[PDB]
Design a protein around this motif. Structure first.
Motif, PDB file in Angstrom:
ATOM      1  N   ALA A  86       0.730  -1.189   0.164  1.00 24.61           N
ATOM      2  CA  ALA A  86       0.088  -0.134  -0.023  1.00 24.61           C
ATOM      3  C   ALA A  86       0.840   1.103   0.037  1.00 24.61           C
ATOM      4  CB  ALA A  86      -0.940   0.102   1.228  1.00 24.61           C
ATOM      5  N   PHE A  87       0.461   2.328  -0.862  1.00 22.56           N
ATOM      6  CA  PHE A  87       1.434   3.472  -0.510  1.00 22.56           C
ATOM      7  C   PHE A  87       0.569   4.780  -0.449  1.00 22.56           C
ATOM      8  CE2 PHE A  87       0.438   2.837  -5.038  1.00 22.56           C
ATOM      9  CZ  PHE A  87       0.413   4.291  -5.368  1.00 22.56           C
ATOM     10  N   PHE A  88      -0.648   4.490  -0.481  1.00 27.24           N
ATOM     11  CA  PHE A  88      -1.593   5.735  -0.214  1.00 27.24           C
ATOM     12  C   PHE A  88      -2.920   5.396   0.467  1.00 27.24           C
ATOM     13  CE2 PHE A  88      -2.367  10.356  -0.755  1.00 27.24           C
ATOM     14  CZ  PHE A  88      -3.800  10.200  -0.971  1.00 27.24           C
ATOM     15  N   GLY A  89      -3.526   5.937   1.395  1.00 22.92           N
ATOM     16  CA  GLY A  89      -4.984   5.634   1.745  1.00 22.92           C
ATOM     17  C   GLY A  89      -5.877   6.726   1.845  1.00 22.92           C
ATOM     18  N   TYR A 116      -9.594  12.287   5.310  1.00 27.26           N
ATOM     19  CA  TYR A 116      -8.361  11.800   5.968  1.00 27.26           C
ATOM     20  C   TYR A 116      -7.558  11.041   4.822  1.00 27.26           C
ATOM     21  CZ  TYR A 116     -12.180  11.932   9.510  1.00 27.26           C
ATOM     22  OH  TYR A 116     -13.101  11.991  10.437  1.00 27.26           O
ATOM     23  N   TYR A 117      -6.196  11.193   4.883  1.00 27.44           N
ATOM     24  CA  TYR A 117      -5.492  10.579   4.044  1.00 27.44           C
ATOM     25  C   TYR A 117      -4.066  10.174   4.744  1.00 27.44           C
ATOM     26  CZ  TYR A 117      -2.498  14.476   2.833  1.00 27.44           C
ATOM     27  OH  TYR A 117      -1.553  15.451   2.719  1.00 27.44           O
ATOM     28  N   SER A 156       3.513   8.071   3.065  1.00 21.90           N
ATOM     29  CA  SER A 156       4.757   7.487   3.559  1.00 21.90           C
ATOM     30  C   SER A 156       5.631   8.794   4.228  1.00 21.90           C
ATOM     31  CB  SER A 156       5.911   7.242   2.480  1.00 21.90           C
ATOM     32  OG  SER A 156       6.324   8.198   1.862  1.00 21.90           O
ATOM     33  N   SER A 157       4.762  10.013   4.311  1.00 23.36           N
ATOM     34  CA  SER A 157       5.087  11.149   5.300  1.00 23.36           C
ATOM     35  C   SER A 157       4.047  11.082   6.473  1.00 23.36           C
ATOM     36  CB  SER A 157       4.704  12.316   4.535  1.00 23.36           C
ATOM     37  OG  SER A 157       3.728  13.148   5.213  1.00 23.36           O
ATOM     38  N   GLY A 158       3.180  10.473   6.431  1.00 19.16           N
ATOM     39  CA  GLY A 158       2.013  10.690   7.636  1.00 19.16           C
ATOM     40  C   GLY A 158       0.926  10.589   7.315  1.00 19.16           C
ATOM     41  N   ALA A 159      -0.139  10.673   8.332  1.00 21.32           N
ATOM     42  CA  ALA A 159      -1.555  10.678   8.435  1.00 21.32           C
ATOM     43  C   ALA A 159      -2.220  11.731   8.668  1.00 21.32           C
ATOM     44  CB  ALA A 159      -2.138   9.580   9.451  1.00 21.32           C
TER      45      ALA A 159
END
Lengths: 252, 252
Positions: free
Chosen positions: B112-115, B126-127, B130-133
């Motif tokens: 997974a690389f993005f949500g 919300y997203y 690899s930088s954070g939530a």
């Protein structure tokens, strides 16, 4: 006072309460400001809400019962008020919380002539008077849900249950109006503690009944003599006429 | 495609889907048009959202995974898409429903690389990456509560539990973000009949994990091997690192 006045006053309050909370950021909202008469933390969002509603009910001749301040005034019309039903959601920004108002010609639930629940995150307006129950000005009725296999709102599922769905949104007043309009098939608060309060439940119950639902305590008995004071507590089983007995059957 | 393309694409998608649903009345939303790849009905709300999404998506080099229309395409970025998680809520005007998207670099959740989870009702976005939530472009973190007397979302309580609150809102993707947020201390999908599908779990799983949560299968197994393709549904045990080991014992 009569039903049209209660409706005009309630709308006054919801409008003023919704702006007091809408402009208060979640950070301000979640901070304790005091302890309620009811025994729980008063959050800043509850007291701003509670303050806008009292400045309206003050100019009217009533006895109001509320969580934070409690029993107030000495008027012959009793008012059960939850200025902010769903505080936890409000502080978390979860769009399910409401003002709830129930007006009664006596200190007991059976003498109610108006009930009003306004969701402050959506503008959804629920009310009930002698002409029936409404959602945003539109007639509403409970569901014809005669199966146990249905959509229940329940506090709290404790075991295996046969429901198609189970939901818990955190705002009893509001979820009683989700039952009333037929969006859920039943509402249950069967917590052995009897934790639901009168300002929390009275608008919802009355509205649910005007919409045709049967609304009882745990054992099926009437809530008619529930008192608008701080020490009243209740459990609730609510569904249409055919489904209600099966539910009572279910939890007994 | 990278994490920045993924945010751009999700945002335009959020826009089309928000537009369409917002325009249709409840009586319309709720119509069965109606048969999807699981055997659950497709409501008019579901189809309109899917169409809007897919129209934007398969202009990309992606394999789409949806319940409604099943697996679409042959590109090698895998996108777990549920265009309207919380359909039951949406069709009744209850404002907890979201579009959910999870982009991976294989068909496995571990790549997974993005949500991305967008509240179609409130506009909350919300997203994670690899930088954070984030929540409305402000970085977030999960609560650090360590006791079982906490605030829990739970599909479904079956026995007596020690929680301070239990809630069930009807949109697991949104609900994993409530956890991702700190709003709620845990998220539990312990249903014996694992019904949760990857396209409703993957993004909120992704966002919660970037927000610091531990999120695993029911026994503590890693979720990295769960796949975007099919037949298997999830159980979820989501909590901060200190409460998670405790939750695993409790549901014993």
């Amino acid at each position: 006072m009569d039903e049209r006045d209660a409706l005009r006053i309630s709308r006054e309050i919801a409008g003023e309460v919704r702006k007091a909370i809408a402009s208060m950021p979640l950070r301000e909202r979640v901070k304790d400001v005091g302890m309620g008469k009811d025994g729980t933390p008063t959050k800043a969002a509850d007291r701003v809400a509670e303050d806008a509603a009292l400045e309206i009910l003050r100019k009217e001749r009533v006895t109001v019962v509320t969580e934070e301040s409690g029993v107030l005034g000495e008027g012959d019309v009793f008012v059960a008020l939850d200025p902010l039903d769903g505080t936890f959601n409000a502080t978390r920004g979860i769009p399910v919380y409401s003002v709830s108002l129930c007006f009664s010609y006596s200190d007991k639930l059976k003498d109610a002539f108006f009930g009003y629940v306004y969701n402050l995150a959506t503008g959804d307006e629920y009310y009930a008077d002698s002409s029936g129950a409404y959602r945003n000005g539109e007639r509403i009725e409970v569901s014809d849900a005669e199966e146990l296999y249905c959509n229940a709102i329940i506090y709290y599922p404790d075991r295996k249950f046969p429901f198609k769905r189970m939901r818990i949104f955190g705002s009893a007043a509001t979820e009683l109006c989700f039952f009333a309009d037929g969006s859920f098939d039943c509402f249950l608060d069967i917590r052995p503690g009897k934790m639901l309060r009168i300002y929390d439940a009275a608008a919802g119950v009355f509205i649910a009944e005007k919409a045709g639902g049967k609304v009882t305590e745990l054992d099926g008995e009437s809530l008619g003599n529930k008192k608008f004071d701080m020490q009243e507590r209740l459990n609730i089983v609510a569904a249409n006429e055919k489904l209600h007995p099966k539910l009572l059957e279910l939890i007994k």
